């Protein structure tokens, strides 16, 4: 089956970064980046990422799903060719592309590392997860670990010689980390002995790397109840001798791997810690704070994973829709040389194709806009600019997490539906992308919890002020619009006004009743998402209108823009009516009446 | 953990639709079914689906089918469970008593179909194909073929298949290439490959009776040259016993996302003996009544996966403790509150609940229309029911399966990370549900049929038959029902206005039909569900106090009206944008 191989969308990625956001203008100013990345460097990095992802990584995706991982007396093996692909990936510098050059990382800004993330996850989501975990663990160690821990573990982790894991989830504890049971017993020598059971640990055990550095959430015996008793620990699979060589295997193991709907090449481990030796990261009781930066970057990364599956689905769907012939166009036969017309002639096929296209390109734009905010928070020399950026990271990362993953699933489902019956057959690859995409809505925080964060902490919690940072920039953009941009800036203004009135309705309603927050959450986040994508599409329309006639690319972009505004943006109205119904109808029945 | 929703089924048929008062003026049914007969059959369907079918769903998925030198084997326990199912009369629950079928009307066979499909969709498909094939033969085959094949097929001893699809011919059956050579003995020799054939080969039965679309050497080109043939796996002697293996077999089976215990075969006919069903060149029409009953059938498959997911999700949401209710800890004795306390978990549960109970009611309503069309003594009542069946079966197929998928996704989401683990059963229900939106006509083709044939083709008369019944219902409503009837009237108004817009916009502009199709069918669906919910609300309002079941119904109705019905506004606005934005790019610009 399949037919369609992965090709990196480098043309669209150049349009978003270089033409829309003009990131290289910003690099010139910020002297932390000025001597790390320019247009030339960035282009060569993406050119190389496209080659390794399409050439080595993508051809492993299907066979990885069909084989899955194997557990053999506590050792986990990845599908054939995974250890070899990983070695190539790590030696190329790809594990630490966004890593700190102070410990041998490449130091690329998030707008570049995010585009690399998208390429690897589109080619093979299971594969992409492995280095994503290592990069995530480096952020937490860099931000909060002691100089001794950082000097001992970070260099091998940015080089991808040593892998990372995040050991948070327990049988009774995923969302509610405050009730974890894993214990850390302080030792006289300054270390801790970690005892407990962790579940659903991605890459908790595998055969890609000689060591895995686990970040383990635990409580000291004397810790407070709840999340304010949580501490974070660095726990190596293999303890490291004084000379930096591998020494004694730590008192921890993988008990089993899970049987899953998807990302079957991603080893998902029950990890048992039996007084495993570990070192505090950050401060006692401040384990959640130790992961604050990690989670901001991981929220965007998981959003990118959802987008990535949508993009892969679309490359297969447009190739299939031009090749597969069935029936005739309703205006009459289009392929008069053939027995039937390519299925792209049919209105409903174009509706599904254009929904995928508008969501993938809008999602790609929004992922870069949020990467730009992470880069401003980190690199801006101005305190007011960094603070505005940080507040925009707090507001938008939940939206990037929940919205890109929800739209990704919708996209992968459209991509499968375009194949008809063939779409249900595994050799065509479309059914795997639905199963792969589905995890991105559940882990690194369920989408329901992402939306409770948004409405609870970022909206109610800031009096609306964090939203208004975003919606004030969109109206400033609207006030700037020429006549031609008016086609997009006018419906955008109306969407922004809808969102502002819904925000005000919610701030009023949440005063009486705390149930109002959770009731509105997921649908409010969607209203916010379609509004944000209207902003991304308006921005992309401005550039394409200016460059119209210079290249066919700009015509395609404007057509996709016009689809988004005509057919997808009106989704805000029903979502706003549903939110405005309130929580009353959610609480008419007691638990027994369900 | 699967329990048949027999109380809800009793409510829909006996309390809302008052199905026994309809059976009173259906003479051909008073001899065959009444309320007690119905209840007792459902109680038996409940036991066999829960006891012997449900336990095989997970291991069936995990094992799937195997191909060994042309022989296809189903998973461990499938043959034994099929034999028990067949011996119980369940394959022929809806079939003609003239050949040993039980003769139960569609309202009752539809509820049996719900139980088997929610227990094990893979399992449910097998008997569904046989019953489908029985409808075609009964309607169109000669007395010789009916007398020879139907009795064993209704008893479940012989299975059926539909051998339609070819590599280049799926949605477009008109471009079929399988040949039928006429023989002097009055039989045909069939040659060609069929693909994606559910139960083309398996180990459940001694014989399989294939209904194969093929063309005679002198057939006219296109769909007007297509004939239907009965092609048995094993030829049958005079004494009715098994003769020689017929000249056909299975080349391979498909590797699928879901329904993995359902054998999907590449069938090779190499001069296989067959017999004409109905008339030469009328092969497609020989399946009109079959495809009407199977469209509702695939609708019910989607609904059934949604109902199984909800039974798991509601048990999990009461048992799993995580965090504390926004208004304060309730489980004072525990480390955390049951996740049913959280607004978002209640939203996902009530969405599943409202779609499942809404789909059950609409399904029963369409089944009631198939029964009225078939058994009504007066021509005008039969004629209107036939028109509502033609209008409503694509809505039942596409809307119950689309709502089914959404329902199974909510049910997985409620389990959190556990929802992605196969042992918990939620993720299988999403993969199994997905097929129902694709086969028996893609939902896109179901939408095209609705707007293209049933609306444009009738000048909106068919939909005015439906909407007239709804407005009569509204006009009759006392003030208590007004809570539901008022927003139902506004939804009916919205649909009519959208219909008028669509009839006008389609004139001279064929692209407008396809462009509006899927989103219009959803507007229709939510309007239809609003009608079903107002009907169930009137009966629950009248019976309030008599039992907690009615308080639960009214509460579910309130959620549907407050949070789901408003979905019509955005869908209406997308439809009204027209086909223009669909046709801005040429194919190369994608
Ligand atoms: C698991 C499985 C079981 C099956 N069982 C059987 C069986 O037992 N017997 C059997 O005969 N068949 C069977 N089929 C085949 C099936 O019923 C259909 O042929 C198939 O679902 C659709 O055909 P396709 O995959 O060739 O899609 P295509 O017809 O190629 O369609 C591809 C896409 O184009 C769209 N499209 C096509 N034509 C039009 C049009 N005119 N207007 C608008 N959109 C259009 C479709 O909606 C779809 O989105 C089965 C299929 C599967 C996957
Ligand atoms: C394939 C896979 C990979 C994973 N990888 C990792 C990993 O590497 N490391 C790791 O530590 N974890 C990992 N996880 C765990 C994952 O993050 C959790 O499963 C997820 O956060 C949900 O937690 P849970 O399964 O315990 O569900 P629960 O927290 O029990 O949630 C159940 C349901 O209740 C809802 N709910 C819970 N609390 C609230 C609340 N306060 N308000 C509203 N709704 C609420 C949830 O949204 C959900 O719908 C992985 C999971 C899987 C399946």
Numbering used by the authors:
A (entry chain A): -1 to 592
B (entry chain B): 3 to 592
Publication passage describing the model:
The structure of FadE1 and FadE2 were solved to a resolution of 2.08 Å and 1.94 Å, respectively. However, the substrate cavity of FadE2 was blocked in the middle, allowing FadE2 to only accommodate substrates with a maximum of 8-10 carbon atoms in the acyl chain. The blockage in the FadE2 substrate-binding cavity was due to the side chains of three amino acids; Met130, Glu296, and Gln303. Similarly, and although it is conserved between FadE2 and FadE1, the glutamine residue (Gln303) in FadE2 is oriented towards the substrate channel, whereas in the C16-CoA-bound FadE1E441A structure, the corresponding residue (Gln302) points away from the substrate-binding site. However, by comparing the substrate-bound FadE1E441A structure with that of apo-FadE2 (with no substrate bound) the analogous residues (Tyr440 and Tyr441, respectively) adopt an exclusively “open” configuration. As previously noted, wild-type FadE2 was completely inactive against C16-CoA. One FAD molecule was bound in each protomer of FadE1 and FadE2.
In this work, we identify the dominant fatty acyl-CoA dehydrogenases (designated FadE1 and FadE2, respectively) required for growth of P. aeruginosa on long- and medium-chain fatty acids. The resulting acyl-CoA enters the β-oxidation cycle, being initially converted to enoyl-CoA by an FAD-dependent fatty acyl-CoA dehydrogenase (FadE), followed by sequential hydration, oxidation, and thiolytic cleavage reactions. The FadE1 enzyme has a broad substrate specificity, being able to use both long- and medium-chain acyl-CoA substrates, whereas FadE2 exclusively uses medium-chain fatty acyl-CoAs. FadE1 (601 residues) and FadE2 (592 residues) had the same overall fold (with the backbone RMSD of 1.001 Å) as other acyl-CoA dehydrogenase (ACAD) superfamily members.
